[PDB]
Amino acid sequence: NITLKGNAISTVGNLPNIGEQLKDFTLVNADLSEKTLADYKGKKVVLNIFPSIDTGVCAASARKFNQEASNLDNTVVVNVSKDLPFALGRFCAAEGLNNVDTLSDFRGHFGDDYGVTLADSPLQGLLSRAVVVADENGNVVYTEQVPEIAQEPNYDAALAALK
Amino acid sequence: ITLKGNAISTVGNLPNIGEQLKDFTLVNADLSEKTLADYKGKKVVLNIFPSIDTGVCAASARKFNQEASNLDNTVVVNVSKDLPFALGRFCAAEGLNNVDTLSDFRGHFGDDYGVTLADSPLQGLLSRAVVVADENGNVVYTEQVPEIAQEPNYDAALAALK
Amino acid sequence: ITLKGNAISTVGNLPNIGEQLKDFTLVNADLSEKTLADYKGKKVVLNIFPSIDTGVCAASARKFNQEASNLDNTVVVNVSKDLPFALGRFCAAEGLNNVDTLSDFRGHFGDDYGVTLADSPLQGLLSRAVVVADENGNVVYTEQVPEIAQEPNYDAALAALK
Amino acid sequence: TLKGNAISTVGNLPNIGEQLKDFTLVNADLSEKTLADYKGKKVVLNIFPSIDTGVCAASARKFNQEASNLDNTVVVNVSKDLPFALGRFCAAEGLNNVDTLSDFRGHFGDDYGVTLADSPLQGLLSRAVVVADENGNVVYTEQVPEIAQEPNYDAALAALK
Structure with missing residues (x-):
């Protein structure tokens, strides 16, 4: 449930x-x-x-x-x-930082295949605020669908799954 | 088009x-x-x-x-x-009235007007084009800019408004 | 400054x-x-x-x-x-007279005026700053924008020109 | 020139x-x-x-x-x-494996001996091509005789081959 x-x-x-x-x-x-x-x-x-x-x-x-x-x-x-x-x-969060890509799904199916494109509200069609972490093999270890689009993700829990 | x-x-x-x-x-x-x-x-x-x-x-x-x-x-x-x-x-709409700048990021304007690019590294973006219509709504003049980089023939378009 | x-x-x-x-x-x-x-x-x-x-x-x-x-x-x-x-x-100086846009890419204006950034990912670029001087050449008013992103106090800077 | x-x-x-x-x-x-x-x-x-x-x-x-x-x-x-x-x-339009980098605060131009010393282009890098192998040894170089002219891309390509 997103809001x-x-x-x-x-x-x-x-x-x-x-x-x-x-x-x-x-x-x-x-x-x-x-x-x-x-x-x-x-x-x-x-x-x-x-x-x-x-x-x-x-x-x-x-x-x-x-x-x-x-x-x-x-x-x-x-x-x-x-x-x-x-x-x-x-x-800006990728300013001067290495190992950070900023990529666009303006013509892809990332939002579709990952179930994150927003369905209504003035933000309809934009991606939702979410974090997906995967291991070296490629299996998802941790996810978060941020309940409020304005709020920031739990970056500490996301880091912990990587650690 | 090129x-x-x-x-x-x-x-x-x-x-x-x-x-x-x-x-x-x-x-x-x-x-x-x-x-x-x-x-x-x-x-x-x-x-x-x-x-x-x-x-x-x-x-x-x-x-x-x-x-x-x-x-x-x-x-x-x-x-x-x-x-x-x-x-x-x-910036071209800075300080100008009666000029809107709008987004088709979730619409079908590009398909409905036949301007969405089908190949090239700009695939999915709209092509460079101009459509002028009268007060009733009938299309009076169009331009499909032959080179996407080039600027439109704004003088011919202005003439259609006249 | 930030x-x-x-x-x-x-x-x-x-x-x-x-x-x-x-x-x-x-x-x-x-x-x-x-x-x-x-x-x-x-x-x-x-x-x-x-x-x-x-x-x-x-x-x-x-x-x-x-x-x-x-x-x-x-x-x-x-x-x-x-x-x-x-x-x-x-663009803001486009078509305007008596407004020059100049480059310090091979000078030391940034050094001589003490505005070149020493660290940060913007190191080597100039900081956001305003220097107003009179016809004799002595500085009348200055502004060092505390935050580079914010716009200068164009109203106070203009007052010195008057 | x-x-x-x-x-x-x-x-x-x-x-x-x-x-x-x-x-x-x-x-x-x-x-x-x-x-x-x-x-x-x-x-x-x-x-x-x-x-x-x-x-x-x-x-x-x-x-x-x-x-x-x-x-x-x-x-x-x-x-x-x-x-x-x-x-x-523009020449890198849509292409992978092409980087475009700036020497505005580095010493690439100095260390590579290509920074221009006079002419209205003083301070800019000269038109040049340096090709090296996988270990890093320079295999081919060119100092383009006229800065306006384009390099001999084929001779450069041959060094890669």
Whole structure:
């Protein structure tokens, strides 16, 4: 059950469960190049799923997690949104950080295949706020569907699953 | 049509002269929605972009919006696949009245108007095109910009409003 | 001063009110050079940017550049580390006279004015700062924007020009 | 030469047989890339006065398509352009295995002896191509005689082969 500012929102589909294998995808980078699930083969992955990364309001917690998670051995943080590739560079949480990709699902099926596209509310069609963590093999270890789209994810619990 | 010299193709065709404008629902930057009904009885210019978040001073586009807005009962509407969160970076509508910049990120404007790109690295974005309609709503003039990078023939479009 | 909230520091210190402006050599968009001599006897506004190539409409700067140039014997000079090849993308000075956009990519204006950033991912770029001087060349008013993202106090800076 | 008149560079380009010197360049997202990021990969150093020209040449587009397709090969564009303008390199349109980096605060241009010493382009990198093998030894270099002219992309490509 997702909500927006208290009011009820729903997502098309369902988020992956712990133990399920990560679903394939094709996302677009800021230079219009494509990234695929194969690009992360054998590496521990954090899917950082946003309604938008073009809001301009970063956060000490949001930045601190992306820095810490990248520091982890053989780990990558992957930001997904419906934002066009022309705005992916505006994600401040990846400023100066390595091992952090910011990718666009503007023409993909990530939101569909992962059950995160929002179904109603003025944010309909955007992704919901969610975090999916997978291991080196690719099976989901931890998930969170943030109950309130405005609130930040439990970055500490997400980090702990990686640890 | 071509993109940076190589040939690109669009899903569909632009509307024909004499045909009525197809309905749509586009989203404003403040997450408000606009519909074809919002422009009933007004001459409409549809300015269709691959992106309005390119970062290039739209000097020619700003000159058109200033002249077109000065015209009686005329509206300029910018349509692109950019999220409503990026519409504010379109400067050509800065300080100009009767000019909307709207998002088709969750609509079917691009398909309904036959402008969505079918191949090339810009696949899924709208192609560069211009549609001018009369007050009744019948399409008067169209332009499918041959080179997606190139700017529209804003002078010919302005003439249709006249 | 802060950069996106975190603390950043600049190599040096801004000039004080009453001091003479230090000389410089900046490059225009067409690869020509401009010097402090180019503004002798004219009231000068130094608008110092980390970048003018960010893609933002800079509504406030356009209102300042329009008003300041309307003033008699006054020039606005935008300085940044952007190469001369990108200066054309600063839209707020488009079509305005007596407003220059210059590059310090091979000078030490940033050093001589104490605005170059020493750390942070923006290290090597200029900080957000404003220096206003009179016709004789002595600084009358300055502003070091505490947060690089925020817009300068264009109203207080303009007052010094008057 | 530049527009017929003679131009000079601060330093000298690396010689064939020499190892690639380290560097620290900036990506468009303000991230840093180093020579270590390309260890064991075939490297083409594509050195520009500016990539903010807005009109990518036919020969240049063909090279990036062919070179990037090559197995264990990377094309690296280095220029003095600020990272905010690196995105204006059109020749890398949609392509993988092509990086565009900035030397606006590094010493790539100095350490590689390509920074221009005079002419209106003073301070910018010269037009040059440096190709090295997987171990890092320079196999091919070119100092483009006219900064406006395009490099001999075929001779560079042959060194990769």
